[PDB]
Design a protein around this ligand. Structure first.
Ligand SMILES: *[C@@H]1O[C@H](CO)[C@@H](O[C@@H]2O[C@H](CO)[C@@H](O)[C@H](O)[C@H]2NC(C)=O)[C@H](O)[C@H]1NC(C)=O
Ligand code: NAG
Ligand code: NAG
Ligand code: NAG
Ligand code: NAG
Ligand code: NAG
Lengths: 49, 100, 22, 322, 100
């Protein structure tokens, strides 16, 4: 459920930002998305661990 | 010029022509501006004709309705998952195996 | 199977991967 | 003919030292167990990202883009006493060669000569730097590991599209390979010499060693990568609408509304061709936030509203969020 | 003179004004753009005639070649670490023993 959230970005879709936005202009959005999903995966793995 | 990605049927976009529908092969599909990867099959999901597309528990794309001819098609991803190997110690032999 | 664990089995009930037990 | 490469195609990624430490580096490299070209013809050759060269007596190379005087080109000659490096514009022939009495080949730096032994070269030109790698090894490609030593680097700073070779006379055979960006595992020595290397993109066992940072593996199951099938084609289904959206009527208008009394127009239920937009002089605009100005036809949306007014000129960028 | 930019890589630069070499003390160094502090001590290993600086498993600058001469040095950080204290409590006495 939390994978499909926007994490404060423009779009919640994984690959729609590849064509809607310029790849020069999508760097900050994709960095925020990957660090949010990394934090979520880290806390899930620690709980599971 | 103002644009919004609202949950509405697509009306205005590029004049690029469509192609013939293909089944039983997982490819990338562009259905009314929705980008996704999966296989297109005949869907048993029948509902009242008043909704454009639906979602699931995973909040992904599973039901589609192209506006040219109104039929429901099923979407599911093709083969995925990790791959491992089977091998003994390299000092003895090099006979390896592939595990799916 | 003995019937006791049979009854206990009957009573007790996508990028992920669910590995089966060894 | 076609000959299969066995070991050649490994050079030092950088001028660094490691004391027998296993390391993984992803640069432009020659793929292992991939066949290379053995040429015996008496032409034009393409050039990918990174090129492999090998020869048995024969000197001279041709590099450039279109081999004419309209662009920069590289001419290097190392006959018997010195090597020259020339970047300029010059016209070349279809099949130039040499005759040490006559020369029928038609900045400047001079260095040491490059001179049974096997000659191999790798010429990589990225980031405006033309890299040169060479090593002479004594002994039909021989079997045995060897690490290709790096030569000097010259900042030419141009593009390379096509390349050729020169024949030395007082045709012959030469080897030309190709490169591909992939990951290698490199093993160094205590003296600082690469003595072993392997690629982890061709064999499951080498891929298993690739994620373990060692060529020695033990018994057990190791998870290395994922299994996935690639999509074959692409399918696009668009709505069947042919109505020719009124962009020309709203743009080619002799009068607009005021800034404080702007009017609103809605464009919907038509086909929108975003290619007639550019016939109204060069613009001070197309700086777009939330949408790509280069990609305006693949994405599909709805409910487009357009307003018309005028601006002073000193605050064109003031029409922006934030 | 005419200055032209955005046309070629760097060919001509200005002076550098390097200095002498110090030993057995941790100071900041500038070895071909390398930034860091450490003790410059004479080494025993030898390098091939194309490297400039070495590394380790930790990926830190530990060995470097001088640009002025042909003597291989080492980079080792000088003394560091947290300080510890020894006390029997203020209710008994006030003498303390510092421990490095
Ligand atoms: C840079 O200049 C120094 C000047 O001292 C050179 O050091 C000399 O190198 C020669 C080479 O055999 C020695 O015979 C001298 O004894 C060195 N001088 C001193 C004071 O020890 C150094 O070689 C030069 N480096 C380069 C790359 O040219
Ligand atoms: C396994 O490897 C060791 C080296 O560590 C070697 O001594 C031994 O003979 C090997 N076992 C074989 C080849 O059966
Ligand atoms: C390698 O062999 C294949 C099949 O014979 C051929 O199509 C290909 O062109 C060869 N590659 C080179 C670089 O010659
Ligand atoms: C010429 O080199 C420049 C380097 O910036 C590169 O951008 C350009 O694509 C090259 N030309 C061709 C035709 O590849
Ligand atoms: C490494 O250097 C030492 C010098 O002590 C030498 O004895 C040894 O042969 C060298 N090894 C190689 C592989 O060059
Ligand atoms: C577009 O063509 C399809 C072809 O089957 C047709 O069903 C549809 O009605 C057409 N669209 C319109 C708006 O007539």
């Amino acid at each position: 459920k939390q994978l499909s959230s926007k994490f404060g970005a423009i779009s919640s879709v994984l690959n729609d930002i590849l064509s809607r936005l310029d790849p020069p202009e999508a760097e900050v959005q994709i960095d925020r998305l990957i660090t949010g999903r990394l934090q979520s995966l880290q806390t899930y793995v620690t709980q599971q661990l | 010029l103002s644009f919004e990605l609202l949950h509405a049927p697509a009306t205005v976009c590029g004049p690029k022509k469509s192609t013939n529908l293909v089944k039983n092969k997982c490819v990338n599909f562009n259905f009314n501006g929705l980008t996704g990867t999966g296989v297109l099959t005949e869907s048993n999901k029948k509902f009242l004709p008043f909704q454009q597309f639906g979602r699931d528990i995973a909040d992904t794309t599973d039901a589609v309705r192209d506006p040219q001819t109104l039929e429901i098609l099923d979407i599911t991803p093709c083969s995925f998952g990790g791959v491992s190997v089977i091998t003994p110690g390299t000092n003895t032999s090099n006979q390896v195996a592939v595990l799916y | 199977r003995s019937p006791i664990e049979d009854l206990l089995f009957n009573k007790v009930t996508n990028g992920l991967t669910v590995l089966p037990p060894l | 003919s076609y000959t299969n490469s066995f070991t050649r195609g490994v050079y030092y990624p950088d001028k660094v030292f490691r004391s027998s430490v296993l390391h993984s580096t992803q640069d432009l490299f020659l793929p292992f167990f991939s066949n290379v070209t053995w040429f015996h013809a008496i032409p034009v050759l393409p050039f990918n990202d990174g090129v492999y060269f090998a020869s048995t007596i024969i000197r001279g190379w041709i590099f450039g883009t279109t081999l004419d005087s309209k662009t920069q080109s590289l001419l290097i000659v190392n006959n018997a006493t010195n090597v020259v490096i020339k970047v300029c514009e010059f016209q070349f022939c279809n099949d130039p060669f040499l005759d040490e009495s006559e020369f029928r080949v038609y900045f400047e730096y001079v260095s040491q000569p490059f001179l049974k032994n096997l000659r191999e070269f790798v010429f990589k030109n990225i980031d405006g730097y033309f890299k040169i790698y060479s090593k002479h090894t004594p002994i039909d490609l021989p079997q045995g590991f060897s690490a290709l030593e790096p030569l000097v680097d010259l900042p030419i700073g141009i593009n390379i599209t096509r390349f050729q070779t020169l024949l030395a006379l007082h045709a012959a055979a030469y080897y030309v390979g190709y490169l591909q960006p992939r990951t290698f595992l490199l093993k160094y020595n205590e003296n600082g010499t690469i003595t072993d290397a392997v690629d982890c993109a061709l064999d499951p066992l080498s891929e298993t060693k690739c994620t373990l940072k060692s060529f020695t593996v033990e018994k057990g199951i190791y998870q290395t990568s994922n299994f996935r099938v690639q999509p074959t084609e692409s399918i696009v289904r668009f709505p069947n609408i042919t109505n020719l959206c009124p962009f020309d009527e709203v743009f080619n208008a002799t009068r607009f509304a005021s800034v404080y009394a702007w009017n609103r127009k809605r464009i919907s239920n038509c086909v929108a061709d975003y290619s007639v937009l550019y016939n109204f002089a060069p613009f001070f605009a197309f700086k777009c936030y939330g949408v790509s100005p280069t990609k305006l036809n693949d994405l599909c949306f709805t409910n487009v509203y357009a307003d018309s007014f005028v601006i002073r000129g000193n605050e064109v960028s003031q029409i922006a969020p934030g």
